[PDB]
Design a protein around this ligand. Structure first.
Ligand code: ZN
Length: 257
């Protein structure tokens, strides 16, 4: 099926998912000199106080840390968002080299990786109904750069050896996602889509300005993961990022000047 190789990569997705060439696709390049400061944007509210992580899974495309979203234990509000959005999972996109890996770009600059914290609009009952709505999801995008290690990310890094191949999952309780946030919450925001098939245009993207630092040893462990399932030929899980798509008829707003 779909993947990131030469024969099933982003360039081929449009054949099975025509929305790939749609009106509001992601990711996109963020031109900081074109983004408009929107003073009508309310402060962003990240309430991960009662976050309840459950499992970590290798799905053949990346790894997801899932949370219990049956209640408003971990929600995102404010900013350009109306209503409450529940955290359902987070995952990363990274490269085979430190100069690439992120999905969104800033003035064309690519980062080593990108963290995506996925939330869904509670007004819609469940995640499945939410992806069918133009304002169904809110994804918090965070850039990763190679520098000093990130304490909050080591716990994830430590368990990657247990979910090396596609289909593997491991218990991952009591993880605190607040450990993955940078100091500042300044951000850029625009209407877009999921960056992987089905590429549904149901996402309000919130990309933070300030990246978090991770060590080379930490990113190296991400690169040790496998796209393939156990017993199959080994394909290193690297460069699982979709490149920037045309902004078209969209405007990127900034919460800061
Ligand atoms: Zn993602």
């Amino acid at each position: 099926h779909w993947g990131y190789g030469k024969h099933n990569g982003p360039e081929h997705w449009h054949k099975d998912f025509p929305i790939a060439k749609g009106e509001r696709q992601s990711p996109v390049d963020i031109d900081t000199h074109t983004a408009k400061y929107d003073p009508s944007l309310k402060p962003l509210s990240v309430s991960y106080d009662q976050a309840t992580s459950l499992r970590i899974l290798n799905n053949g495309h990346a790894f997801n840390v899932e949370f219990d979203d049956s209640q408003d234990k971990a929600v995102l509000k404010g900013g350009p968002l109306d209503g409450t959005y529940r955290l359902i999972q987070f995952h990363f996109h990274w490269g085979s080299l430190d100069g690439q890996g992120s999905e969104h770009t800033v003035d064309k600059k690519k980062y080593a990786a990108e963290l995506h914290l996925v939330h869904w609009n509670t007004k819609y009952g469940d995640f499945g109904k939410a992806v069918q709505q133009p304002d169904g999801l809110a994804v918090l995008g965070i850039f990763l750069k190679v520098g000093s290690a990130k304490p909050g990310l080591q716990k994830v890094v430590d368990v990657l050896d247990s979910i090396k191949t596609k289909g593997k999952s491991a218990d991952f309780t009591n993880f605190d996602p607040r450990g993955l946030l940078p100091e500042s919450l300044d951000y850029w925001t625009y209407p877009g889509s999921l960056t992987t098939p089905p590429l549904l245009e149901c996402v309000t993207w919130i990309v933070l300005k300030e990246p978090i630092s991770v060590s080379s040893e930490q990113v190296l462990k991400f690169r040790k993961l496998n796209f393939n399932g156990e017993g199959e030929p080994e394909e290193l899980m690297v460069d699982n990022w979709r490149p920037a798509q045309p902004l078209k008829n969209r405007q990127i707003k900034a919460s800061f000047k």
